[PDB]
Amino acid sequence: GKLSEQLKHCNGILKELLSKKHAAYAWPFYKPVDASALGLHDYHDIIKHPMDLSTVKRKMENRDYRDAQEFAADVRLMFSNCYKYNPPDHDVVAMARKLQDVFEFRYAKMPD
Ligand SMILES: CNC(=O)c1cc(C(=O)NC2CC2)cc([C@@H](C)c2ccccc2)n1
């Protein structure tokens, strides 16, 4: 389905976040947190709105996002979930900060 200019910029960012370029730090955000598999039995008590890049991709493919702000809200929800659940010295927080730096700097170049 035909995306607005801003949603094409969003789709471009999404492809970059999923690309081999960022795989060393992006991989924990590829798929929903499998709380049971990881032994994180408190995850769904602490995180009320799980989010990950596969869900963002499905919503982009389904034309769920009506504007760039709605897309950005889900990407930032994903990072916020990471910062809320994890102690700030866990490697996954370092990885979140690096992927969010990629996101924020390219999101800022949104066409007007
Ligand atoms: C989005 N993923 C997560 O929040 C997450 C959390 C935790 C975790 O055990 N956290 C406990 C609270 C301290 C572990 C992991 C895994 C996938 C992992 C391992 C090593 C490096 C990067 C990731 N991801």
Structural account:
- The protein is mostly helical.
- The protein has helices at 5-18, 23-26, 35-38, 43-46, 53-61, 68-85, 91-107.
- It has a single domain, classed as Bromodomain-like (Histone Acetyltransferase, Chain A), CATH 1.20.920.10.
- The chain is built from seven helices and no strands.
- Helix 1 runs antiparallel to helix 5 (53-61).
- Bound molecules: ligand ULE.
- The site of ligand ULE has 13 residues, from helix 6 and helix 7.
Brief sketch in words of this structure:
Belongs to the BET family. The protein is mostly helical and 112 residues long. It has helices at 5-18, 23-26, 35-38, 43-46, 53-61, 68-85, 91-107.
Q: Give the number of domains.
A: 1
* Name of the CATH class: Mainly Alpha
Give me the CATH superfamily.
Bromodomain-like
CATH architecture field? Up-down Bundle
Radius of gyration: 14 Å
Task: Give me the number of helical elements.
Answer: 7
Separation, N- and C-terminal Cα atoms:
21 Å
Q: Summarize the main sheet.
A: none
Helix/strand/pairing category: mainly alpha
* SSE order, one letter for each helix or strand: HHHHHHH
Instruction: Give the % helix.
Output: 55-70%
Count of β-strands: 0
